Amino acid sequence: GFPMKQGVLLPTRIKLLLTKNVSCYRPRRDGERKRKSVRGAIVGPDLAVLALVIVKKGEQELEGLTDTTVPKRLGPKRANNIRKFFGLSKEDDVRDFVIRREVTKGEKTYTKAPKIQRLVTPQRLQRKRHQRALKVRNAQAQREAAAEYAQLLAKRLSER
Amino acid sequence: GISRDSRHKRSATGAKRAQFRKKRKFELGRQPANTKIGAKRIHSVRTRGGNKKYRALRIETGNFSWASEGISKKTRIAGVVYHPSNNELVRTNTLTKAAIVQIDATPFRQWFEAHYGQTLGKAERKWAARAASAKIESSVESQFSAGRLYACISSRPGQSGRCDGYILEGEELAFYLRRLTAKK
Amino acid sequence: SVGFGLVYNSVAEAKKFEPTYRLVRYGLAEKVEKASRQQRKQKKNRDKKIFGTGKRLAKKVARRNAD
Amino acid sequence: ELTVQSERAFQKQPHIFNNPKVKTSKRTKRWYKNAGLGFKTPKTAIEGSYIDKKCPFTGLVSIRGKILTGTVVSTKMHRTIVIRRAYLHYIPKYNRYEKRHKNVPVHVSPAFRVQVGDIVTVGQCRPISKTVRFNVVKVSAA
Amino acid sequence: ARGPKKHLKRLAAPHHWLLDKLSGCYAPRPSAGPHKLRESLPLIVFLRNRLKYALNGREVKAILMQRHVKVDGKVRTDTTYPAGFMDVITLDATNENFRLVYDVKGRFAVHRITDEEASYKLGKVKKVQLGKKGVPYVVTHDGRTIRYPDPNIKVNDTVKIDLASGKITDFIKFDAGKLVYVTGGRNLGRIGTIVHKERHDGGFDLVHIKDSLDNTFVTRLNNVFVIGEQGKPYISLPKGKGIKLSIAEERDRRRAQQ
RNA sequence: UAUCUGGUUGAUCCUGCCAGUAGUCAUAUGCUUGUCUCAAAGAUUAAGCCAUGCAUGUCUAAGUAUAAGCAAUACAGUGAAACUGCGAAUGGCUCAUUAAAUCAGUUAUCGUUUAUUUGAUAGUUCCCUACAUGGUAUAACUGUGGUAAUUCUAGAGCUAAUACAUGCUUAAAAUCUCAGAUGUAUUUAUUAGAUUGAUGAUUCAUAAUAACUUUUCGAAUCGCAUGGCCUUGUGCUGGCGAUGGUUCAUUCAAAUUUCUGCCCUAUCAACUUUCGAUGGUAGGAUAGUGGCCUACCAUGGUUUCAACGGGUAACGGGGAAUAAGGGUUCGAUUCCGGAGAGGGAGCCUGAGAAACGGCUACCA
RNA sequence: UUUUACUUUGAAAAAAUUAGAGUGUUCAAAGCAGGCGUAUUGCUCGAAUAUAUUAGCAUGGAAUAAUAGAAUAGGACG
RNA sequence: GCCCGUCGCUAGUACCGAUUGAAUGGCUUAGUGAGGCCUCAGGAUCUGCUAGCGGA
Ligand SMILES: [Mg+2]
Ligand SMILES: [Mg+2]
Ligand SMILES: [Mg+2]
Ligand SMILES: [Mg+2]
Ligand SMILES: [Mg+2]
Ligand SMILES: [Mg+2]
Ligand SMILES: [Mg+2]
Ligand SMILES: [Mg+2]
Ligand SMILES: [Mg+2]
Ligand SMILES: [Mg+2]
Ligand SMILES: [Mg+2]
Ligand SMILES: [Mg+2]
Ligand SMILES: [Mg+2]
Ligand SMILES: [Mg+2]
Ligand SMILES: [Mg+2]
């Protein structure tokens, strides 16, 4: 039952100290690494099962290859992702034909349309305005505090 | 790993100390950088407190300051000619603080020409304002005819990733010239 | 006999600020019948081992045991 | 110190620049400091040519801890002495004392001249060696 | 020992909390905050042991999470917020304002104050330092930094802090003859006038204090807090005014109630 | 709360021990055991070995929700799973090591790191998106499986962010360079820092100049209310907050650190020094000082005032027993400090571990 | 304004523990509680004090004990 | 009266003792040396900009 290692290039199985961003291992703790025995990259009789990806269609279709197909389980979620999917350009008001789903559960079937992220919204525009105005307000407050303190210094320096 | 503790390193009476407190991470040392010349390669080390150090390996350019006209041009380090701590560092051209190196001197000559207009080594009257009092020295300009300026490293390449320094001048330069005309 | 007493300004504040065990004693909202502590801890330990939802493991042991 | 430039490196105070462009008077600009606590900076420190980055007056070390007094018992190291610090320790059961001593290695600047004897005052500094945590600040050659 | 401790065992808590011994194994560990660990008084302690408003820590956090308590103008919903000396604890439900001040026994006395003087608070200037861009600032005993301070405000002075704008309205200068609270040591909680300051370069600054009854006690400069001049304290003093009666006259005052 | 008595003689007075006597939060054991309050308890020997079960997880309004999860015109509520964040370095246990080591009291950091809390703090960013950039990205989920077995995972299809990686909007004011540069962060050099702030004291705070960076930061984030003015539109504005973020200060801390103080032993008197021992210069390394390490050099450093070595059925202290006074003995153990997680060593993550209810290797 | 010892005073020497103040836990060991009046829509006292006398720190004293002064005067005074 | 020592029997406790005796534990020269870490490289395959060229 040992999986294959993408680039080991051996016909047997060997132990590697596996890390976060590698196959055959899921770290149970931040920073964890484990020495697990993985199987090499070159196929041989030892393999109980191979894993192949169809990249070319030659002749009569297999009955589980093109006839029966699955839909894409989830539509895009980000605003620009829906734009890039359905082809509509920037100024097209993309909140309308978001793919939905009807739930035949209790004869009410209230569609669960996904929330969209990064959407240009007046709430986010108000947040941006609030931040970019807080910055200038703070800068003006600091400038006037410094000015009045300089006034105090140039007043208390007049005593000689 | 390497430990900077004093629980080893037997006491001043000469007594060998008994061991307690297996090595602590707050006492670790690390490997020397041994910065070489050319094809900049800097590695980021994660240090205590989440901070970062930069191990310079194979550094090619350094920021060197004349300190007499205050220019601090960025230039190329040619090689190491003298090191007070280890001649092996000179042999291996290992870049290190306080190493005496040779720098290109071309940016310094270009700045001298754009500033004084006085043909150092081979908006009109700014050269007049920077008046005849422009003679630098009889040892810092004779190196411009060879295009190699003696300099001393001042940063720590293994710590800061940079190989900055200053051009030798005056009695420091005389000292290092004596050392070089002895050991060369 | 000497004890302590509280008088809440309203039954709303009574329900909001009173301990659940004392409300149960009195006769207000009653105990939630949780499993024993050992069983709940063993259960969360058993759920620690499985990674995701579990339906994957369900359909995987749907074929095995037996063939 | 008998050809002060006696090391492999050039000995100099850091960031104390003698500009060869300006035609100053001394041409050997020398930094010093007042150590504090009423220890007078000696004229040897003011006018000498030694470097001693561990000197409490011309070096990079500060006197900020305990001020101790002791008797110099060794001057055989370079810029370092060992001072003897005799005291009496109380033994309560006998209501009496016993003589005890502790040797203390101290860094002595070239500003001072110190021989065996020469009760000295020393001030705590940062650890400047494996065993040295004190700098001579008053020679008091008794 | 591998990191910062998060527990405070009972019998390790500061004694001036008057904590019960056989209540539990642990005390409320003061979270990091303005004053200190030892010189602090957690809001749970002040709400469940100094006023008896709450009966448990659960009830303390119940009081806290509905924004009732307020430390120095802000809400401070932290169950173990380290409130300390000169802090204003105002509660609007049961509207009343307390100033955490030391009684003469050295505990945080419950000292009701009025809003017209709870508006502000006092602060002992811990340090005067130039910040980035050459902007001077003062650091006070409660960990407050205040920019552009008066150029005559030095260390050990006291500053009156608006506590709504957080700025210096006035400042008392440390000098012989001003009213000082003692905020540490054996005489913790006493009030008096500065008589003399012994310098001790390198060592510790000492100050001799003469209370109203002409008792003269010396103490370290670290824990003396200027609170105004004699007879004109810039704040309201607690019920005892830091007199430090001896046990005999204390027993006498007690038996004067028959 | 200052006490003695029996035993050497035929008898005596002594020395002197044996014996008696009293206590022990001081342990065992025998016999006995009705009541109330309090509650030590696998330390001693084996820091010996351990079946089994539990002991570290965590969600608000406020990071990410199309659960084919529930329930009454995009989800408006709840919400498994998962990603993200934070925590898991606290606690609890034990006393094996450990004799200038720990520890105690007392110092220092002008010798450093410091998540968090608290307070303050950032108009300067650009060489055809900002009315908001990408997948170069993936999880959960869907379907195909291998192994007897693990908190094992491969293969294929989506999918977001406060994950990841990029990237603009803020004039005005503002001086130097020969139109450009001028925030902050890093590195170097120089200058001021006086008599124009502070300290007992600095090459301090801080500012300036000239440059330098395998780019640092300068919110492309979230909630609840929606208000005011108006070119009435996709207008302009404006709240209270949350989270995040540079630097400084603060706090919780950490690490080093001054002085003085440890039991028996000389049938331990010299020890340390090639192989760092003591110091100097320089460098490297560290968060930082420092022979911490390296190179060169010097020949030092400790010691009868007991070094060095050996023993401890030795963790240190607060304390405990007994006690006229002085002392003697004890302290594994309710608090503080230390160390360890079978013996060593190494290391990932992280502010913080040389972590062991984390990993890696060797030994048993 | 030589150098010490000594001694007085003061700060320090966590809490618990110890001595110990108050307090009818029914007494007591203990604990830091509690007390005082009423038909309130509540008033009030406390959780002291002493000691850790080694080491360091600050201060008063100047007996006791040690130490140093001007002798080839390189002495003191303005 | 009291008394001393050899020798002989019994029992016990230590001592010396061929056996280059034995076992256990500590320290240690030398040899070999796992492992992680730093470093010289290396390049499966994984997408991007146009065989040119970069990044992981
Ligand atoms: Mg007896
Ligand atoms: Mg045991
Ligand atoms: Mg612990
Ligand atoms: Mg500086
Ligand atoms: Mg060094
Ligand atoms: Mg002991
Ligand atoms: Mg032991
Ligand atoms: Mg103990
Ligand atoms: Mg034991
Ligand atoms: Mg403990
Ligand atoms: Mg540990
Ligand atoms: Mg075990
Ligand atoms: Mg470990
Ligand atoms: Mg365990
Ligand atoms: Mg643990």
Swiss-Prot record, chain A:
Entry function = Component of the ribosome, a large ribonucleoprotein complex responsible for the synthesis of proteins in the cell. The small ribosomal subunit (SSU) binds messenger RNAs (mRNAs) and translates the encoded message by selecting cognate aminoacyl-transfer RNA (tRNA) molecules. The large subunit (LSU) contains the ribosomal catalytic site termed the peptidyl transferase center (PTC), which catalyzes the formation of peptide bonds, thereby polymerizing the amino acids delivered by tRNAs into a polypeptide chain.
Q: From what organism does this protein derive?
A: Saccharomyces cerevisiae (strain ATCC 204508 / S288c)
One annotated GO molecular function is: structural constituent of ribosome
Which residue positions does Phosphothreonine occur at?
Answer: 104
Q: Which domain of life is it from?
A: Eukaryota
Where is the cross-link described as Glycyl lysine isopeptide (Lys-Gly) (interchain with G-Cter in ubiquitin)?
57, 72, 90, 155
Q: How does it assemble?
A: Component of the small ribosomal subunit (SSU). Mature yeast ribosomes consist of a small (40S) and a large (60S) subunit. The 40S small subunit contains 1 molecule of ribosomal RNA (18S rRNA) and 33 different proteins (encoded by 57 genes). The large 60S subunit contains 3 rRNA molecules (25S, 5.8S and 5S rRNA) and 46 different proteins (encoded by 81 genes). Interacts with snoRNA U3. uS11 interacts with MPP10. Component of the ribosomal small subunit (SSU) processome composed of at least 40 protein subunits and snoRNA U3.
Print the miscellaneous field. Answer: Present with 66000 molecules/cell in log phase SD medium. There are 2 genes for eS6 in yeast.
From Swiss-Prot, chain B:
Q: Which residues carry this modification: Phosphothreonine?
A: 61, 106
Q: Name one GO biological process term.
A: translation
Q: Does the keyword section mention Metal-binding?
A: no
Q: Which residues carry this modification: Phosphoserine?
A: 65, 68, 72, 85, 138-139, 142, 145
Please list where the region (Disordered) is annotated: 1-30
Q: Which UniProt keywords apply?
A: Cytoplasm, Phosphoprotein, Ribonucleoprotein, Ribosomal protein
Q: Which family does it belong to?
A: Belongs to the eukaryotic ribosomal protein eS8 family.
Protein known as: Small ribosomal subunit protein eS8B
Native source organism of the sequence: Saccharomyces cerevisiae (strain ATCC 204508 / S288c) (Baker's yeast)
What gene is this protein translated from?
Answer: RPS8B
UniProtKB/Swiss-Prot annotation, chain C:
Q: Where is this region: Disordered?
A: 34-67
**Which subcellular locations apply to this protein?**
Cytoplasm
Q: Where is the signal peptide?
A: none
Briefly state the modifications made to the protein after translation. Answer: N-terminally acetylated by acetyltransferase NatA. Also partially acetylated by NatC.
Q: Where is the composition biased (Basic residues)?
A: 37-47, 56-67
Please give the subunit comment from the record. Component of the small ribosomal subunit (SSU). Mature yeast ribosomes consist of a small (40S) and a large (60S) subunit. The 40S small subunit contains 1 molecule of ribosomal RNA (18S rRNA) and 33 different proteins (encoded by 57 genes). The large 60S subunit contains 3 rRNA molecules (25S, 5.8S and 5S rRNA) and 46 different proteins (encoded by 81 genes).
Q: What does this protein do?
A: Component of the ribosome, a large ribonucleoprotein complex responsible for the synthesis of proteins in the cell. The small ribosomal subunit (SSU) binds messenger RNAs (mRNAs) and translates the encoded message by selecting cognate aminoacyl-transfer RNA (tRNA) molecules. The large subunit (LSU) contains the ribosomal catalytic site termed the peptidyl transferase center (PTC), which catalyzes the formation of peptide bonds, thereby polymerizing the amino acids delivered by tRNAs into a polypeptide chain.
Q: Which family does it belong to?
A: Belongs to the eukaryotic ribosomal protein eS24 family.
* Other comment: There are 2 genes for eS24 in yeast.
Q: Please state what the protein is called.
A: Small ribosomal subunit protein eS24A
Q: Which organism is it from?
A: Saccharomyces cerevisiae (strain ATCC 204508 / S288c)
Instruction: Kindly list the organism's lineage.
Output: Eukaryota, Fungi, Dikarya, Ascomycota, Saccharomycotina
Which gene underlies this protein?
Answer: RPS24A
Residues included from the entire protein = 69 to 135 of 135
From Swiss-Prot, chain E:
Q: Which organism is it from?
A: Saccharomyces cerevisiae (strain ATCC 204508 / S288c) (Baker's yeast)
| UniProt keyword annotations, A-Z | Cytoplasm, Isopeptide bond, Phosphoprotein, Ribonucleoprotein, Ribosomal protein, RNA-binding, rRNA-binding, Ubl conjugation
Q: Pfam family of this protein, just one?
A: 40S_S4_C
Q: Could you give the subunit structure recorded for this chain?
A: Component of the small ribosomal subunit (SSU). Mature yeast ribosomes consist of a small (40S) and a large (60S) subunit. The 40S small subunit contains 1 molecule of ribosomal RNA (18S rRNA) and 33 different proteins (encoded by 57 genes). The large 60S subunit contains 3 rRNA molecules (25S, 5.8S and 5S rRNA) and 46 different proteins (encoded by 81 genes).
The name of this protein is Small ribosomal subunit protein eS4A
What this chain does, per the record?
Component of the ribosome, a large ribonucleoprotein complex responsible for the synthesis of proteins in the cell. The small ribosomal subunit (SSU) binds messenger RNAs (mRNAs) and translates the encoded message by selecting cognate aminoacyl-transfer RNA (tRNA) molecules. The large subunit (LSU) contains the ribosomal catalytic site termed the peptidyl transferase center (PTC), which catalyzes the formation of peptide bonds, thereby polymerizing the amino acids delivered by tRNAs into a polypeptide chain.
Residues found modified as Phosphoserine: 31, 246
The organism that produces this protein has a lineage beginning with: Eukaryota, Fungi, Dikarya, Ascomycota, Saccharomycotina
| Any one GO MF annotation of this record | RNA binding
